[PDB]
């Protein structure tokens, strides 16, 4: 169940310059964008909408907060770099992903909210924030940042990965006996590139033996990667 | 100690007695080698004995804390050590630091040796750069699922055997005094279990009974009591 | 074995000791020795010793060939005439005779310019036909012409190995490494062995390189005997040049045995399998015709919309959108927009009459002149538009027959050594009219008609414009496009000295020396001519910054196969003209990531000449990174030049003679907007 969500974010962030005649005539102008958050997250809606929105646009990749926490607290200097290159790339889409001591995270998040709010510029670029859990983020970010729309992902576990699995396996070839009860029952906090990654390493693992059929025990062996990926991080 | 040096002379000693003309006329370099078997003995005595007869350096990766910052500020950890490998050409590297947790947690080191064997197999800017794989868990069958096999030397590592305890028991018996009424075939061929380090546990833990009984030398009964001691655990 | 029982045996020179010990040395020659033949110091005395002297020469060539030598190794073999699949023959033949006969053919073949090297060369030919090591012994025996008798001597059983491997890597190394005179033996010897063998399209490539009518006649009676047809008609017409389709239509028109080769020798059977199937299996939308034809303004998006609208890439709505849209366009958009109905009718021969007859006899001049231009664009085998267009051209001063001479002579050149229209163009070549595009499309028209002549020609039209080119040296644009007619009339050369002929006959002040370097560009189609590379780097720093532009602009044709040498540091210089040289040297290939990677830094530039020229090669080399560069140019500008060119990129975002020749007319865009009259009629379209 994501058709209304993808036409609502399609109309939400594709109303600007890409087909713009329905945006600068009515006089609404919510030039703040949405903040992506998914209960599973981890590239499912982030990657799915990150590749689905690239039909005709300019993408800006910002993934992970490691470069801030792996060393001294440089802080908002790289935010100023991405803001001057986002200023030199104004008709783009600012996509910040994987937003994951606290005395400094609060001040670089306060300065991040201040510079991100558009305190020195009007609405010209669509800023998109992304995270795994929307509850870890302090509610003080919602009012300045989100004024346009926030999207929840009410996924049906069978028909989200069975519809995405069906569409994504209707053009390419695969193997038989592909079970789904352990998938919809066990998989959590993973993406569609992960079921595509285990079908690709499943059919590729069968390709190592030069076979086109995949055994159920081989699909559980590839499933173990999913079983440990959610337990590691 | 002959079946391992006879197979390692062509892995480490090959670029010794061969000038630079063999790089453009013969075999360039041996890529890698793995020794399956729990590191009881010979884990560092082989690379440190041949390296002792090579006078090279010993640089480890050992991806962990206190080393990710020393080897460059930030990189893939296979480029700064390669700069130190162009600056230090003679360098023997030794990869030393479940299928559920060890698959990924050990797959970091598996990726490290994949990209290291893809830099060695990729290009040769300098010589005397060799890596030795050391995995002795389920991740050696998972490594066997990841090792391509095309560039790999096969050297048998016998900790799950007896001769590797006979020879290293004699080597560990030349340093100390031993009696003449001893038979190393039963007391050295009848020692199964964890690895070849329980032989060193037989000597070190046997010293307690040699000094306990005031024996100026070492007998076979002491080695039997030490076999029981090393067979208490593991 | 140890050298104790065998070492003191070769020291004595006894005749029985040789007659029994030398065959024992032949028994031990199966592996040579236990080591690297250290006994050289004790076996070198036998040099002058001899009763079975062939065994002495065999052991001596075994050891001298074993350890080290360069000239004394094969002498025992050329004096021996060897006598007396085993390891013995594999060692003493395969590697020892591989390097042995390699340095013997190198020394003797590269020394004298007998019969021992031929008889023994065939002994190694048979020996390697027994050992059967492919792609190594051949590539070693390339230079010893013996290559012809070697190919026709070996190409009996190993057809795929020697033909595919040897002809493939020896073809690539035969245009990159091996010079042309041996490549002729490749073309004719491959005419023989490939004439006997199957897989005709490779012999059709031998017709792309040979341009011979006997090969295509034999491949049409042999391709007719073996029965589909529309495919080899498609790449038949694509692979053939201007010469062998009229020679093909004259021998095909002579016998052809079914009239289906008369049917194939025209512009009907290359598009009858393409156009309806492309309309059926593929479909184009109206976002670009309707969009790029709906956001038009400023009288230049009407130009770009008239050219993109002129493109076929089924839908003809923007053309049929009422009327007066052509009236609101400029004169060059009246030639382009009047020729739009012709460009959209590359097929439907019977439709061009009822579609273009409206523009005919109209009130505006460029509507009817562009209408005859469209009559020249719609077809290339009908040739029935000759008389009505040519009948009125005899005005020569200011009449509409001058623009009808542009569209009718250039379009008629697209519809075509045609000598009747050449004699009709003789007063046009001698017209000397101040209008540039008259002798522009006249020289380009006779050149594009004569692309592929046998080592060029010295005909009285290019000689006429050489003498008249020496009459008055004004309007340097003539000194830029007239050399295009010259070198395009000289097209088809492989080793012609006509560049030195013109280098002795038409050299003068820098302008006609720039004509000379244009003939140099049209004189280096490609061979083993490293002298052009040392001369290239030698003239890389010439003061005259235009002969570098053209002579270095020929990079896209000289090294057009070894794609690894093309990337260089030309962009790191300050001579922006060199950046344009690399920009032209990109080409129209598949467009890998390195190409667009160069189109990034070439895309970011301030001068409108390079910022206007970068979307052209960027659009030609590209056929979710298509509409994104358009938003990038939207980020660059937000002039009209980059707007028209960026709509051309909006369309085009998604060795052949006609597909590559008309690019130099586009390579002269640094001038007035009048280039749109000639840019709209390119024949490089598929």
From Swiss-Prot, chain A:
What is the protein's known function?
Component of the 26S proteasome, a multiprotein complex involved in the ATP-dependent degradation of ubiquitinated proteins. This complex plays a key role in the maintenance of protein homeostasis by removing misfolded or damaged proteins, which could impair cellular functions, and by removing proteins whose functions are no longer required. Therefore, the proteasome participates in numerous cellular processes, including cell cycle progression, apoptosis, or DNA damage repair.
Q: Which organism is it from?
A: Homo sapiens
Localization per Swiss-Prot or TrEMBL: Cytoplasm; Nucleus; Membrane
Main location class: cytoplasm
Tell me the outcome of changing residue 128 to T.
Answer: In BKAH; uncertain significance; contrary to the wild type, it fails to rescue eye defects in Rpt2-null Drosophila
Q: Which GO terms describe its biological process?
A: proteasome-mediated ubiquitin-dependent protein catabolic process
* Span of the entire protein shown here: 189 to 433 of 440
Q: Which family does it belong to?
A: Belongs to the AAA ATPase family.
Quaternary state and interactors: Component of the 19S proteasome regulatory particle complex. The 26S proteasome consists of a 20S core particle (CP) and two 19S regulatory subunits (RP). The regulatory particle is made of a lid composed of 9 subunits, a base containing 6 ATPases including PSMC1 and few additional components. Interacts with SCA7. Interacts with NGLY1. Interacts with PAAF1.
* One GO CC term on file: proteasome complex
Origin organism lineage: Eukaryota, Metazoa, Chordata, Craniata, Vertebrata
Please identify the protein, giving its name as recorded.
26S proteasome regulatory subunit 4
Give residue numbers for the modification (N6-acetyllysine).
70
Membrane topology, as annotated, equals: Lipid-anchor
For molecular function, the Gene Ontology terms on record are:
ATP binding; ATP hydrolysis activity; proteasome-activating activity; RNA binding
Residues binding ATP, per UniProt:
38-45
Q: Where is this cross-link: Glycyl lysine isopeptide (Lys-Gly) (interchain with G-Cter in ubiquitin)?
A: 49
Disease per record is: Birk-Aharoni syndrome: An autosomal recessive disorder characterized by failure to thrive, severe developmental delay, intellectual disability, spastic tetraplegia with central hypotonia, chorea, hearing loss, micropenis and undescended testes, as well as mild elevation of liver enzymes.
Swiss-Prot record, chain B:
Say which domain of life the source belongs to.
Answer: Eukaryota
The alphabetized UniProt keywords are:
Acetylation, ATP-binding, Cytoplasm, Nucleotide-binding, Nucleus, Phosphoprotein, Proteasome
Q: Does the keyword DNA-binding apply?
A: no
N6-acetyllysine, modified sites: 69
Q: Where is this region: May mediate interaction with PRPF9?
A: 33-234
The subcellular localization recorded is:
Cytoplasm; Nucleus
Q: Which GO terms describe its molecular function?
A: ATP binding; ATP hydrolysis activity; DNA-binding transcription factor binding; general transcription initiation factor binding; proteasome-activating activity; TBP-class protein binding; thyrotropin-releasing hormone receptor binding; transcription factor binding
Q: Please verify whether the record's keywords include Phosphoprotein.
A: yes
| Binding site residues for ATP | 37-44
Recorded coiled-coil stretches: none
Q: Which GO terms describe its biological process?
A: negative regulation of DNA-templated transcription; negative regulation of programmed cell death; positive regulation of DNA-templated transcription; positive regulation of inclusion body assembly; positive regulation of proteasomal protein catabolic process; proteasome-mediated ubiquitin-dependent protein catabolic process; regulation of transcription by RNA polymerase II
An example GO CC term for this entry is: proteasome complex
The record's function comment reads:
Component of the 26S proteasome, a multiprotein complex involved in the ATP-dependent degradation of ubiquitinated proteins. This complex plays a key role in the maintenance of protein homeostasis by removing misfolded or damaged proteins, which could impair cellular functions, and by removing proteins whose functions are no longer required. Therefore, the proteasome participates in numerous cellular processes, including cell cycle progression, apoptosis, or DNA damage repair.
Family that this chain belongs to: Belongs to the AAA ATPase family.
Protein name, UniProt field? 26S proteasome regulatory subunit 8
The protein's gene is named PSMC5
From Swiss-Prot, chain C:
Question: For bias kind Low complexity, which ranges apply?
Answer: 5-16
User: Would I find Phosphoprotein among this entry's keywords?
Assistant: yes
Residues bearing the modification N6-acetyllysine: 475
Q: Which SUPFAM superfamilies match?
A: ARM repeat
Per its UniProt record, what Pfam families does this chain match? PC_rep, RPN1_C, RPN1_RPN2_N
Sorted alphabetically, the Gene Ontology cellular component annotations on this record are:
cytosol; extracellular exosome; extracellular region; ficolin-1-rich granule lumen; membrane; nucleoplasm; nucleus; proteasome accessory complex
List GO molecular-function terms, semicolon-separated. enzyme regulator activity
- Is-annotated flag, keyword Repeat? yes
Instruction: Give the Phosphoserine positions (modified residues).
Output: 11, 24, 292, 294
Keywords on record: Acetylation, Phosphoprotein, Proteasome, Repeat
**Which PANTHER family is this protein grouped with?**
26S PROTEASOME NON-ATPASE REGULATORY SUBUNIT (PTHR10943), 26S PROTEASOME NON-ATPASE REGULATORY SUBUNIT 2 (PTHR10943:SF1)
Its function?
Answer: Component of the 26S proteasome, a multiprotein complex involved in the ATP-dependent degradation of ubiquitinated proteins. This complex plays a key role in the maintenance of protein homeostasis by removing misfolded or damaged proteins, which could impair cellular functions, and by removing proteins whose functions are no longer required. Therefore, the proteasome participates in numerous cellular processes, including cell cycle progression, apoptosis, or DNA damage repair. Binds to the intracellular domain of tumor necrosis factor type 1 receptor. The binding domain of TRAP1 and TRAP2 resides outside the death domain of TNFR1.
Record note on quaternary structure: Component of the 19S proteasome regulatory particle complex. The 26S proteasome consists of a 20S core particle (CP) and two 19S regulatory subunits (RP). The regulatory particle is made of a lid composed of 9 subunits, a base containing 6 ATPases and few additional components including PSMD2. Interacts with RPGRIP1L. Interacts with CRY1 in a KDM8-dependent manner.
Protein name per its UniProtKB record = 26S proteasome non-ATPase regulatory subunit 2
Q: Which organism is it from?
A: Homo sapiens (Human)
> What is the gene called?
PSMD2
């Amino acid at each position: 169940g994501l058709d209304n969500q993808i036409q609502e974010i399609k109309e939400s962030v594709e109303l600007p310059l890409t087909h713009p005649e329905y945006y600068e005539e009515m006089g609404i102008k919510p030039p703040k964008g949405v903040i992506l958050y998914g209960p599973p997250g981890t590239g499912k809606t982030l990657l799915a909408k990150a590749v689905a929105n690239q039909t005709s646009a300019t993408f800006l990749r910002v993934v992970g907060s490691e470069l801030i926490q792996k060393y001294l607290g440089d802080g908002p200097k790289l935010v100023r770099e991405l803001f001057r290159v986002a200023e030199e790339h104004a008709p783009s889409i600012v996509f910040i992903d994987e937003i994951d001591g606290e005395r400094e995270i609060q001040r670089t998040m306060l300065e991040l909210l201040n510079q991100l709010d558009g305190f020195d510029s009007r609405g010209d670029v669509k800023v998109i924030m992304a995270t795994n859990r929307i509850e870890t983020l302090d509610p003080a970010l919602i009012r300045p940042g989100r004024i346009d729309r926030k999207i929840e992902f009410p996924l049906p576990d069978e028909k989200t990965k069975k519809r995405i699995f069906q569409i994504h396996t209707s053009r390419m070839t695969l193997a038989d006996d592909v079970t789904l009860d352990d998938l919809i029952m066990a998989k959590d906090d993973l993406s569609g590139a992960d079921i595509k990654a285990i079908c690709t390493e499943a059919g590729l693992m069968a390709l190592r033996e030069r076979r086109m059929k995949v055994t159920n025990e081989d699909f559980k062996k590839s499933k173990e990667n999913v079983l440990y990926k959610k337990q590691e991080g | 100690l002959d079946k391992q040096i006879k197979e390692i002379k062509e892995v480490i000693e090959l670029p010794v007695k061969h000038p630079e003309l063999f790089e453009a006329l013969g075999i360039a370099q041996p890529k890698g080698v793995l020794l399956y078997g729990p590191p009881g003995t010979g884990k560092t005595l082989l690379a440190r004995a041949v390296a002792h007869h090579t006078d090279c350096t010993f640089i480890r990766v050992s991806g962990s804390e206190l080393v990710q910052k020393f080897i460059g500020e930030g990189a893939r950890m296979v480029r700064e050590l390669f700069v130190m490998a162009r600056e230090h050409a003679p360098s023997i590297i030794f990869m030393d630091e479940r299928l559920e947790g060890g698959s990924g947690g050990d797959s970091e080191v598996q990726r490290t040796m994949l990209e290291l064997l893809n830099q060695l197999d990729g290009f040769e800017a300098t010589k005397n750069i060799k890596v030795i794989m050391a995995t002795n868990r389920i991740d050696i069958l998972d490594s066997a699922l990841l090792r391509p096999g095309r560039i790999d030397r096969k050297i048998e590592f016998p900790p799950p055997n007896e001769e590797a305890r006979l020879d290293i028991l004699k080597i560990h018996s030349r340093k100390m005094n031993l009696t003449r009424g001893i038979n190393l075939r039963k007391i050295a061929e009848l020692m199964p279990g964890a690895s070849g380090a329980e032989v060193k546990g037989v000597c070190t833990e046997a010293g307690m009974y040699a000094l306990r009984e005031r024996r100026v030398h070492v007998t076979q009964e002491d080695f039997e009591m030490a076999v029981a001691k090393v067979m208490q655990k593991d | 074995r140890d050298k104790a029982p065998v070492q003191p045996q070769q020291s004595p020179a006894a005749a029985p000791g040789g007659t029994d010990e030398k065959p024992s040395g032949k028994e031990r020659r199966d592996a040579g020795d236990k080591d690297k033949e250290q006994e050289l110091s004790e076996e070198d005395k036998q040099l002058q010793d001899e009763l079975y002297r062939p065994a002495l020469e065999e052991l001596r060539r075994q050891i001298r060939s074993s350890t080290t030598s360069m000239t004394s190794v094969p002498k025992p073999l050329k004096f021996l005439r060897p006598h007396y699949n085993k390891r013995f023959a594999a060692d003493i033949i395969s590697v020892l005779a591989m390097t042995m006969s390699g340095e013997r053919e190198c020394l003797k073949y590269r020394l004298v310019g007998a019969g021992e090297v031929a008889k023994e060369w065939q002994e190694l030919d048979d020996a390697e036909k027994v050992q059967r090591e492919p792609l190594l012994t051949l590539v070693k025996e390339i230079v010893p012409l013996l290559m012809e008798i070697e190919q026709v001597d070996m190409l009996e059983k190993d057809i795929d190995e020697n033909a595919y491997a040897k002809v493939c890597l020896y073809l690539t190394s035969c245009v990159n490494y091996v010079p042309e005179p041996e490549n002729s033996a490749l073309l004719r010897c491959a005419l023989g062995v490939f004439r006997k063998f199957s897989r005709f399209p490779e012999a059709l490539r031998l017709a792309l390189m040979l341009n011979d009518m006997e090969l295509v006649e034999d491949i049409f009676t042999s391709c007719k005997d073996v029965v589909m047809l529309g495919r080899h008609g498609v790449f038949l017409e694509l692979s053939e040049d201007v010469e062998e389709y009229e020679d093909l239509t004259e021998i095909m028109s002579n016998v052809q045995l079914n009239s289906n080769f008369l049917a194939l020798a025209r512009e009907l059977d290359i598009m009858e399998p393409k156009v309806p199937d492309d309309i059926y299996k593929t479909h184009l939308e109206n976002n670009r015709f309707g969009g790029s034809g709906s956001q038009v303004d400023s009288a230049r998006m009407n130009l770009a919309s008239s050219f993109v609208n002129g493109f076929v890439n089924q839908d003809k709505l923007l053309t049929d959108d009422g009327n007066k849209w052509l009236y609101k366009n400029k004169d060059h958009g009246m030639l382009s927009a009047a020729a739009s109905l012709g460009m959209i009718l590359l097929w439907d021969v019977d439709g061009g009459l009822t579609q273009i007859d409206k523009y005919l006899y109209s009130s505006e001049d460029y509507i009817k002149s562009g209408a005859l231009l469209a009559c020249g664009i719609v077809n290339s085998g009908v040739r029935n538009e000759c008389d009505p267009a040519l009948a009125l051209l005899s005005d020569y001063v200011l009449h509409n027959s001058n623009t009808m001479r542009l569209g009718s002579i250039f379009g008629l050149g697209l519809a075509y050594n045609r000598e009747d229209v050449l004699t009709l163009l003789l007063p046009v070549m001698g017209d000397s009219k101040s209008s540039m595009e008259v002798a522009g499309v006249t020289a380009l028209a006779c050149g594009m008609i004569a692309v592929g002549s046998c080592n060029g020609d010295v005909t009285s039209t290019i000689l006429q414009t050489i003498m008249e080119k020496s009459e008055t040296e004004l309007k340097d644009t003539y000194a830029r496009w007239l050399p295009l007619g010259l070198g395009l009339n000289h097209l088809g050369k492989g080793e012609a000295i006509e560049a030195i002929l013109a280098a002795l006959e038409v050299v003068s002040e820098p302008f006609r020396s720039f004509a000379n370097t244009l003939v140099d560009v049209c004189a280096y189609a490609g061979s083993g001519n490293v002298l052009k590379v040392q001369q290239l780097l030698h003239i890389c720093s010439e003061h005259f910054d235009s002969k570098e532009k053209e002579e270095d602009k020929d990079k896209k044709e000289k090294k057009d196969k070894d794609k690894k040498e093309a990337p260089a540091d030309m962009g790191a210089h300050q001579g922006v003209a060199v950046l344009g040289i690399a920009l032209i040297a990109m080409g129209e290939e598949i467009g890998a990531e390195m190409a667009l990677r160069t189109f990034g830094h070439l895309l970011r530039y301030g001068e409108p000449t390079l910022r206007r020229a970068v979307p052209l090669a960027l659009a030609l080399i590209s056929v979710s990174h298509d509409a994104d560069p358009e938003v990038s140019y939207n980020s660059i500008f937000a002039a009209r030049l980059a707007a028209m060119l960026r709509q051309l990129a909006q369309y085009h975002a998604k060795k052949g003679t006609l597909t590559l020749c008309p690019y130099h007319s586009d390579r002269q865009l640094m001038s007035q907007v009048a280039v749109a009259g000639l840019l709209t009629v390119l024949v490089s379209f598929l």
